[PDB]
Structures are given as C-alpha cells and as structure tokens.
Amino acid sequence: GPEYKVAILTVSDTVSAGAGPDRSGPRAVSVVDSSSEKLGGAKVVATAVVPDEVERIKDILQKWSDVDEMDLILTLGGTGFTPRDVTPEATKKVIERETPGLLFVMMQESLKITPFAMLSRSAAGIRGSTLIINMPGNPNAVAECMEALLPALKHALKQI
Amino acid sequence: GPEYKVAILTVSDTVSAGAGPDRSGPRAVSVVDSSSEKLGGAKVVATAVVPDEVERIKDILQKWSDVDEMDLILTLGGTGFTPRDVTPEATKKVIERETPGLLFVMMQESLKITPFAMLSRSAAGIRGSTLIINMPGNPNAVAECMEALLPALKHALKQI
Amino acid sequence: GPEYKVAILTVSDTVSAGAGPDRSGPRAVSVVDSSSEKLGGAKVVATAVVPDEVERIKDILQKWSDVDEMDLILTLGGTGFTPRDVTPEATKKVIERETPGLLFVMMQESLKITPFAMLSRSAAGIRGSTLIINMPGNPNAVAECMEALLPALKHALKQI
C-alpha cells in the first residue's frame, strides 16, 4: 500500500518512564511523511519508546528487522558522550553490513551548522533487508539529517 | 623489476559465471599503469575474478597477501547496498590495520561528483605488508578514486 | 583543584629506549595548558613513554583509565602505515564507545593542510569516564589537532 515501511524508535529513560514527553518522535514522523514522494513513497507505520538500555534497544531492532521486516528504522537519542547514551553500541551489535557513507554525510552536513556535531556517535548499517540509522534526539535534528540523506536514500532503499 | 606489485580483483557473479565481460578490470589496470610514475613506479602483475561470496574473496586476499606478497590490491565491486555486495565484509575479515584515512578521502572526493557516493561501503586497510582498498564496480570509478589518493599512496606504500 | 585531568602518552621505540628525546610530548603539554580556559579548566598531570608495542600501550591505557581515572588521555605516535605503528590497534582494544566524530574532524582539518593527512590511522573513544584520542607524533600536529577539537572538547568532557 505504502511501499516503504518506516519505523521510529525513540530512546530515552525519561520518556520511557513516562516522566516527560516525546518531542522528537512526532517531528521525525512528520519529516518522513513530508518526504515520502522524494523517498520513493514511504510511510511510518510504527513507533516505540525504550529506555537507555542496550538489551532493550537490541530487541526492538531485532524484532523490527527479523519479524516485522521494516525497510527503514530511524532511532532518536542516546548517541552522545553521556554515559547512558548506548544507542550506538546497541546498534553495532545487530547490523550486519555497515554503511559509513551515510554517517559520513550526516557528520559533514551537521558540522556546517555547528561544531558540537562532532559529539554524535551515531552508527548505521543494514540488517537483513532493513536499513537502520541512528539519529540524535533534538527535534530539528531529524529534519536536517533527512535533508542530507534524501538525495540518495531512495536508491538506497531500492537496492536493499 | 617493477617495484610496487599491484593486483586487481574483480568481484562479480555475472563476470565470474562467464555471463558477461569485465569492463572495470581493464580501466583499473590502465589507471594504475598510467599512474606508475606518480605511484613510485608500480605495475599490475595479476588479476582475477571471483563471484560475490565472502569465502571466495577472503581466499584471494589471503593468498595474494600472505603467499604472493602483493604490495597493493584493489578490489572492484560488491560494495553497494544490494544483498549480494559483500566485498567489504570480506575485506574486513582479513585486514589487520585499518586506514580510514583513505576511506575518508575516497568518500569526500566522490561526494563532489554525486550524492550517490554515500552508497559505497568500501573498506580498506593493511594485511602483512599488503595495502588493500575496495573500490566500486563502475569503470570511471577507479579513475576518480585513484586521482583522489595518488598524492599520498606513494608515501603510503613506502611506509609499509 | 585542576578540574580536567589530562595525561599524555608518548609512543615511540626510540624515545622509550633512551636513544633520542621527546619533542612532541612537551608541545602537547603546552598546547593543553595554553587551552585550559577554553577547555573548561584542564591541566596535564602525567606523562609517560612506552615503545611501539600493543601490550605496553594497552596497559597504560587501562591503568590511567581504570585506576588513575584520568578524564582525557592524548597519545602521540604510532599512528602511521609503518609496521611498527600499532597505537590505534592498541587503542581499539581498550575503548568501549567510539567517537568517530572526533576522528572525523581531525581528519577534515588536517587534510586542509596536506594530503598526507590521509595517512593517520588514528583511533579514539571512551573507556569508563576517560576520553582517549590518538594523535600524530609531529610536534605541530598536536597544536593543529587541538585547534580543530577545542570548540567542542569542553562540552565533550563535561558530558562524560
């Protein structure tokens, strides 16, 4: 129906505990929708929240790739230098083929906005036929990151 | 005689099965020759073809590194997002020391020509005293990648 | 007293054996001190020398992280293509969370100075609450690397 199935995983002790809301989730979802055309037609069909714990992250990534077979998973948060940030360690354990080019573009564009970009430790890669991309928690982040990738993500999903 | 020994490994189900020809092999070959002076005097003494299967790739990288002692092995193909592209996985299993600097440079220059460059998953590094660099299947690809690296590849082979 | 504790590890067969002196150690030293303000108040409290041998580098990395609890360890040398350069390999075995962004920035800025930059194989990452960054052995190197990081290294140590 929707061709490319996207899922978004918000990572955040605060949100997961119900101690605060998700401000970045909704922004991402909406960027994806707004980019559907240029993405080759894609839609978000699922979101979830988990705390900052690797096992918790690992599971969802496994589930959504092996069982639900999503095409594109974006994670938000837990990619910084704080000790609780372990999204990338969780992500590196489940991908099979790395995609450094994506990381390279995300790091290049974001460094044009600000140097603090050097603090993302985002990972990315493919598992089965799911592309997974770690992104930062800021609400505007997703917007800028997606702008950077959109010129090729289409061909990227097709090739998978 | 020739000082730097170069070997070129083409990776491609089609080509290895005899179903089609190698267009990229012979461009790479000639780019190396035409860069010999600037490379410190180098020449290509061997080429092969294998299909897209890690074991087939690992074996040659092993053999040509540990038994034939090539100084420089370029691989062509099997670096995209397609499921059969497994060259980088295979290369990661046989190198001992990474040289991200080279990837950084290849990714930078090629992004200037097109965004689709973010889709290489190229790997590289050293095994014993062999430098190994993955490159893309396109015939012009080798020409542009090499242009990017030649300013330093010479000091690189010498330091090894 | 000093807030950010900094330690500098010089990596170098020649120095460690008493056969020549350390010219890089002391520039790094003074760069850090000269950047204390902008770094959030930091000071270099220890230095050491070891040869080019992974064990010897691992142990100090381990020790200064797990026992002395440094906040920032800069290494110098052993990051090139020469067979003895094994600093990155040693660093990669002791870190727990990579920080590619820092490698990214270092590599970008030095490329602007010269292409030979492409020959650093530096690694970097966090272990416990210690940030570790490999740097090149040249004396000016540390000055340039730091200039590239300073804008964020402060936020970086604070987050850890």
Side-chain angles (χ1 to χ4, degrees), chain B residues 89-102:
Chain B
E89 286 65 40
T91 298
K92 269 158 206 195
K93 275 166 185 204
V94 311
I95 65 190
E96 293 155 359
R97 307 184 286 135
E98 300 178 33
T99 58
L102 306 183

Side-chain angles (χ1 to χ4, degrees), chain C residues 51-69:
Chain C
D52 300 294
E53 284 175 28
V54 287
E55 295 308 320
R56 288 301 295 290
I57 309 181
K58 287 200 272 177
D59 298 335
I60 304 317
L61 294 181
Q62 274 158 14
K63 179 168 161 320
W64 285 348
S65 296
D66 311 332
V67 182
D68 299 310
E69 276 185 321

Side-chain angles (χ1 to χ4, degrees), chain B residues 97-98 101-102 104 149 159, chain C residues 81-82 85 104 118 121:
Chain B
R97 307 184 286 135
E98 300 178 33
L102 306 183
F104 189 99
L149 287 184
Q159 287 177 194
Chain C
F81 278 44
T82 288
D85 289 327
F104 179 102
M118 86 174 71
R121 314 193 301 96

